[PDB]
Each structure stands twice: as C-alpha cells, then as structure tokens.
Amino acid sequence: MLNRVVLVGRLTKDPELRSVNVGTFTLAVNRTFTNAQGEREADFINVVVFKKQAENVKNYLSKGSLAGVDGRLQTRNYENKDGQRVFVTEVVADSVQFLEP
Amino acid sequence: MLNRVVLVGRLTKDPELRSTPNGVNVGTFTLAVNRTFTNAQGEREADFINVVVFKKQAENVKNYLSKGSLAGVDGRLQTRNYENKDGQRVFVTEVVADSVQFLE
Amino acid sequence: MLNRVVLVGRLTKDPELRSTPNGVNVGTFTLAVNRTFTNAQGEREADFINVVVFKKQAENVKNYLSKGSLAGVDGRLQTRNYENKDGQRVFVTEVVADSVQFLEPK
Amino acid sequence: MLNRVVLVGRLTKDPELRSTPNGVNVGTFTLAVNRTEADFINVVVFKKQAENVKNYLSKGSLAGVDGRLQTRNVFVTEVVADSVQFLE
Numbered sequence: 373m374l375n376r377v378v379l380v381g382r383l384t385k386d387p388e389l390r391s392v393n394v395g396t397f398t399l400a401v402n403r404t405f406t407n408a409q410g411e412r413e414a415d416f417i418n419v420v421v422f423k424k425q426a427e428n429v430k431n432y433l434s435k436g437s438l439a440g441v442d443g444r445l446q447t448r449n450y451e452n453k454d455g456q457r458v459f460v461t462e463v464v465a466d467s468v469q470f471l472e473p
Numbered sequence: 474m475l476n477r478v479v480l481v482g483r484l485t486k487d488p489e490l491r492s493t494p495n496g497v498n499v500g501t502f503t504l505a506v507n508r509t510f511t512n513a514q515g516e517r518e519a520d521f522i523n524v525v526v527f528k529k530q531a532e533n534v535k536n537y538l539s540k541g542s543l544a545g546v547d548g549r550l551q552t553r554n555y556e557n558k559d560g561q562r563v564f565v566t567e568v569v570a571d572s573v574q575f576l577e
Numbered sequence: 578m579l580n581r582v583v584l585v586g587r588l589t590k591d592p593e594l595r596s597t598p599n600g601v602n603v604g605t606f607t608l609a610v611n612r613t614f615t616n617a618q619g620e621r622e623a624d625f626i627n628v629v630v631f632k633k634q635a636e637n638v639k640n641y642l643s644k645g646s647l648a649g650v651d652g653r654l655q656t657r658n659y660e661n662k663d664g665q666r667v668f669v670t671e672v673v674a675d676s677v678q679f680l681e682p683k
Numbered sequence: 684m685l686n687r688v689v690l691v692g693r694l695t696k697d698p699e700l701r702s703t704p705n706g707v708n709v710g711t712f713t714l715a716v717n718r719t720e721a722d723f724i725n726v727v728v729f730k731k732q733a734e735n736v737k738n739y740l741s742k743g744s745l746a747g748v749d750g751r752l753q754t755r756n757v758f759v760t761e762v763v764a765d766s767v768q769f770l771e
Contacts, residue, residue: 463550
C-alpha cells in the first residue's frame, strides 16, 4: 500500500549514527501559517536513514541545516526502563536532499 | 516549509467523532498500510497510522467509513506531546488530513 | 532535488508492454483521476496522466490491470521532448512509477 | 481520488502575471527540478497567491511547490499549486 512523506526543515541537532546501522535526526518543519500575533509553530519529526543515505546525512548535515526528506511513514513500539510502552512514528528516508550550497 | 503525506490503507477499527469544548467536529481513525517489501523471513508487515480530520471532513468520514474501508488520505504530519495518567511524557505524531477519499 | 507524485485513478485503456533495444520491459498506461472539486457546470472532471513502469512491475500491470482498473501510483514526474515525421515537437509529461498498487480484485 | 505533487527546483525566468476571462489572477512559472538533466515543470498559482509568488520569487530562486497535477488543452499538463514555499 501507498505511503509517502515529503518534508523540508532544519535539523534540531547534529545527526547521530546508530545501530543494522542507522542514521538519525529530527526535523523542525515550520507550519505555513501563524496566529494573529505572528507566532509560528513547528513539528519535530524523527527521520531515520540507512547505508549511504545514512553516510550522506553524516557528512553534510549539522545542527541548523536546511534539508529535504522523502520517504515512508513507519510505526513501531517498545518498552523502556520505567516500564512504559512508547508509540513511535517516524520517516524512513528514501532520499534526503541537502538544500544548501 | 513543505509538509505532505499521502497514504492508502484500511481502517483498523471504526472511526470516532467528537466535538471539542468549542463545538467543532474532530474525527479520528487509524490506517493500516501494508509495506511494499518483505522482512527477513518473507513476511509483509504493516504500519498503523493515526489520522485526524475536522469539520465536514470529519463528518463524512464518520458516516461513510467503517472498519476495513479502503481509504486514501492527503494531509500533513503534525507532532504533539502531553503527560497522560500514569504520569508519562508521551510524544504523538499523527496525520492531519486535508482530504479523505473513499476508495470503496 | 525533491520530485514526488502520488496518484490514484482508473486506467483509461489496457496497459501496454514493450521491450527496449536492450531487453527491459517498459509498461505504459494513463490514469483518469477525478478532481475533488466541481466545475461551473456542477459535476466532476478528471486529469489524464501518463505513467511509466519497468521490469517485473511492468509485467504485472500488463497481466493484472485492464481498462477501468483502479490503481494507485507512486513515483517521480518526468518531462522530455522529441519529434516525428512532421519533424516538429512533441512535449510529453509522465510519471515514472516507483510502485503501483492494484486497488481492485482480479 | 488522490492527486498530489511535491517538488523543489528553480524558476527558469521571472514568474509572469495574467488573468482569466473572468478576471481571476494567475501567476505562472516553470520549475527546473534536478534529478539525482532536469525536468521542466510548469506551475500555476491563483488569486492572492499569484501576488505572493510575483513578489517573493524571481528567475533562479529556489522554490518548493505543493499541489495537484492538471491537464489542459495543444496538450499541456501543469502543477496547480496549493502553496509555493520560498526557501532561499
């Protein structure tokens, strides 16, 4: 079934590599509208990359970089230290685009 | 900034409709999108995505969609975070649908 | 740069298979995807989008899909331009599909 | 049925102004999207958003587009945009 996600945003932090081996960062995607006082909210979207795509993100992207992301939405579920269940939704990037020279 | 999500899937359960303290309709359902590839043993697994609609979009999805209905969703990916009963910080990301298309 | 198209529609005709100078099979069909809004005349028009598939995916669409089959298409949008006898130009726009989903039974 | 197109590229010229028979304003530009050789995709915007694009974007500017795909006739298919997002 069809599953497609496209985002442009800026990384909140420097990307992490993680593992089997996965590259990870979170993208702040400003909304296109504001309230009457110009306050603009954002969404903080976790993205995961693999292989050379994971390598490209590690060598090009840093805190604050504007990036383009194209992928699938995948959901998983785990339990943590305190004994709580966490519901995870993320973008698994099929192609990431560095939008800055 | 660009924010676009398009999915096709089937509802896992029947949709729920509600009215905020302010009296606008909010519709909720979860969409199961089978993957296009297979896992290490040849299984095709699914993803279970929470979708949100408002206003007439929420009404029409409530009266027309039921458990198992094939639907296409066009919208944006939005993130929230709250502190629920047990006392947890819970991070929710969900699809806010600009248009739901009844495919059956 | 990002280039992304997601469509659902019904095939206008039955799909075509062909095999290039090299051997690879190329699948061809065009999709009628009705608009979500209405015209000044109160009913619903569609847009007719050419789709291109390759390799085994193109085989399946030839073996499974027919005129009227509802299908979903995911891919990238391509533009090229070439000619013919009247050596003047044909402007083609199409979607080359990364994945097709057959939304009806067969 | 679903019809969504999302691109990022650069305008080949400055966007143009124009209006329909019924006086509605239209802004056009063609978008040079890069493969990863380019694709050259015409984009249409409407009403006030045409005033937006004409002020914000010029030849070479990096814009993202989000919208529907539409056919017209001389066959022509364009991207009717729901929002152009000025990135540079």
